[PDB]
């Protein structure tokens, strides 16, 4: 009977201008991808072709690139309003600059609703933030009515800096009542939209009752049926199918990340509001699809401050930052000692009153350190000087590990010494010792970490059966450089912020840095 098509994006992570196939930065215009203008083009074509359409976003279009560091959420709102977004949910990176950084730019200028149904305010923050986000919405699509409902992750307090007067409940219990009410409102078509992950999406399609479709994200998952057109390996079919406990078929969808793809799911309903048929596949925005000038002009005029700002002073140094290759891959090098300090300074959250902070450790490999920095230019540091050290557009990732995978990593890092290999590890919050005269696999003799279950920080030994939360780059978590143990024996993974921004905020705060070689690594 009734038909609608659904267009969704997720986890753009500030890839606002056109990008490469690895979604880092593209220099050959003839083989490039993504962008917001190309997306405008495709969206407008589909909108003219079809009468019933929905464009949705599932959160996390804030951390990444250099547009967020400078403007801080204004570009998001501007170009979302330009594209005619029909709704939006809240992710975990919308709270990076705090709620005060959320409310003004996004929540007040946006012309479209923002949703979450497990987020509740207590105390003085109840008056301020009431009326600005909603648990659910009703929209007239075509000649019918469509009900929406939102949800958001529960680990946001440990993955961002929201506050202490915002609560994050369980998804299912906070979701069911609104569905029930919506049904009592004579509304029979329901869509869930949220930023929680894939597995929880699956559970919401089994435990919750009344949900016709589930749109989601936060896991960076690829769903294709057929033959993939590019590098990404699909984890499943496109309209994923799950048998609900109430005897129904409920799809699930997710369009990878950045802007490399788009979603396109067509549905067929009946007179009562039940899903009959579902088919589609994600779109790939190659150069075959042209751009839209009225957007590129606006982008080009907004890009000036980006270049004006990359030649400016952030801070100062009085020492030589040896980001060389004969040092950072053979011994301890003070650039890493600077880098992990910033990494931790970023991961400072809340005092549970039984711990001073949940994570107290760093790991970093020497292959991610390209160039040095010399202090003989008035003692000045610039964004370019940093981009020349970390030229990959990576991220610093929070994970969990046992106490044995870590020893495996520290033993693999030193099993072939003397070849300028990028497997040497710079550390933070760790005291380690080596003895290179022993057989490979048994070269680590001492290893000490930093107490968290403790009011006074102190260095304690390692227990080969305990969970430790650690920070390390995405290149390592996905198994780069021979670190398969990490990708095989981890117990969770959450993405983080851009590296250059981390270091940038560290340096703009200290305002003068004199890092030193201390003895976090030594040989006996």
């Amino acid at each position, epitope marked *: 009977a009734w038909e609608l098509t659904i267009l969704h994006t997720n986890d753009v992570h500030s890839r606002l201008e056109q990008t490469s196939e690895d979604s880092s930065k593209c220099v050959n215009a003839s083989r490039c991808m993504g962008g917001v203008a190309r997306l405008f083009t495709k969206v407008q074509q589909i909108r003219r072709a079809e009468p019933n359409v929905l464009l949705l976003d599932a959160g996390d279009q804030y951390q990444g690139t250099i547009w967020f560091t400078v403007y801080k959420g204004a570009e998001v709102a501007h170009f979302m309003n330009a594209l005619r977004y029909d709704a939006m949910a809240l992710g975990n990176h919308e709270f990076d600059n705090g709620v005060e950084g959320l409310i003004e730019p996004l929540l007040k200028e946006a012309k479209f609703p923002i949703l979450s149904a497990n987020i*509740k*305010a*207590k*105390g*003085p*923050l*109840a*008056s301020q933030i*009431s009326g600005l986000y909603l648990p659910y919405k009703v929209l007239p699509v075509g000649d019918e009515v469509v009900g929406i409902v939102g949800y958001t992750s*529960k680990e*946001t*307090p*440990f993955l961002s800096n929201p*506050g*202490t*007067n*915002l*609560v*994050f*409940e369980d998804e299912i219990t*906070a979701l069911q*009542p609104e569905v029930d009410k919506l049904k009592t409102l004579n509304v029979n078509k329901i869509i869930a939209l949220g930023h929680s992950g894939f597995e929880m999406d699956k559970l919401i399609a089994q435990k919750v009752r009344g949900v016709d479709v589930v749109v989601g994200g936060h896991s960076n998952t690829f769903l294709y049926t057929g033959n993939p057109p590019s590098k990404e390996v699909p984890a499943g079919k496109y309209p994923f199918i799950v048998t609900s406990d109430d005897g129904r078929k409920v799809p699930v969808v997710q369009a990878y990340a950045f802007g490399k793809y788009l979603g396109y799911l067509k549905i067929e309903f009946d007179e009562r509001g039940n899903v009959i048929s579902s088919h589609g596949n994600p779109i790939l925005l190659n150069s075959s699809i042209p751009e839209d000038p009225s957007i590129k002009a606006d982008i080009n005029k907004w890009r000036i401050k980006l270049d004006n700002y990359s030649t400016q002073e952030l801070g100062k140094t009085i020492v030589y930052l040896d980001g060389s290759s004969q040092s950072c891959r053979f011994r301890e090098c003070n650039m890493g000692n600077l880098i992990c300090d910033a990494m931790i300074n970023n991961n400072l959250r*809340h005092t549970d*009153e*039984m711990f001073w902070n949940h994570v107290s450790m760093c790991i970093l490999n020497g292959g991610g350190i390209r160039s040095p920095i010399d202090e003989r230019n008035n003692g000045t540091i610039t964004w370019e000087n940093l981009a020349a050290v970390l030229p990959f557009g990576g991220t610093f990732d929070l994970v969990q590990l046992k106490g044995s995978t870590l020893k495996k990593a520290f033993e693999h890092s030193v099993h072939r010494y003397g070849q300028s290999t990028g497997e040497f590890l710079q550390v933070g919050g760790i005291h380690v010792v080596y003895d290179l005269s022993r057989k490979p696999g048994d070269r680590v003799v001492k290893l000490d970490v930093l107490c968290t279950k403790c009011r006074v920080p102190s260095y304690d030994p390692l227990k080969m059966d305990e969970v430790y939360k650690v920070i390390l780059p995405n290149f390592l978590a996905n198994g780069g450089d021979g670190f398969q143990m990490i990708k095989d024996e981890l117990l969770r993974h959450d993405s983080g912020d851009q590296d250059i921004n981390v270091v940038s905020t560290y340096i703009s705060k200290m305002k003068v840095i004199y890092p030193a070689v201390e003895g976090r690594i030594k040989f006996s």
Partner: antibody
Amino acid sequence: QVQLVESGGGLVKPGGSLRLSCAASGFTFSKYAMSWIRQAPGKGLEWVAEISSGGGYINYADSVKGRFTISRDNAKNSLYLQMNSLRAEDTAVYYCARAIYYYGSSYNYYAMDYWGQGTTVTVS
Amino acid sequence: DIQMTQSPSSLSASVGDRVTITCRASQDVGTAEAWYQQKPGKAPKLLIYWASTRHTGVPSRFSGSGSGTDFTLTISSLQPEDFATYYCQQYSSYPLTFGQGTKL
């Protein structure tokens, strides 16, 4: 399965001191904030004092601020209250209510889900 | 916040009718507010917090509404076991005040 039983209530002369105690069993006592609520004779409810999950943050009302003292002992799973300058206005029942759980945020600004029977304290 | 006037004081009802109770705050409680029920000489019990959620174990005829400074508890088709005193709270400020009361 949660039960809170109060004890330690009787008759006192204006100026005396009494110590009430709240038992607890049926859950993990080292995770929840707790409060003391008193109901006057045939009147409305009113809030007295509170304590965090580890005795670190203790906050008081205006009346008992300077005469009462809340504390907890997680080892024995019990709560204690100490009243020193008992006036004639402290005549009422006293309830021992638990507090909602907040996953990652603070414990302040809560609502009470599990209450207790209550004790009578008369100061004449 | 501080005041929490529970406007109704005594309503006459019988099994079957539809009863409504209001609780007008003073400055702005936002959406943090709860509803309690105390029988004659027994410990109170929580029904609704967050101004719309229902505590585990409450009958479905109980439902809350309202936001800002005007709330409401509604019971449809009163039952024999539902003649007690109902109280309204607020946890937006920190004297944590209650409501005077209402007998049903």
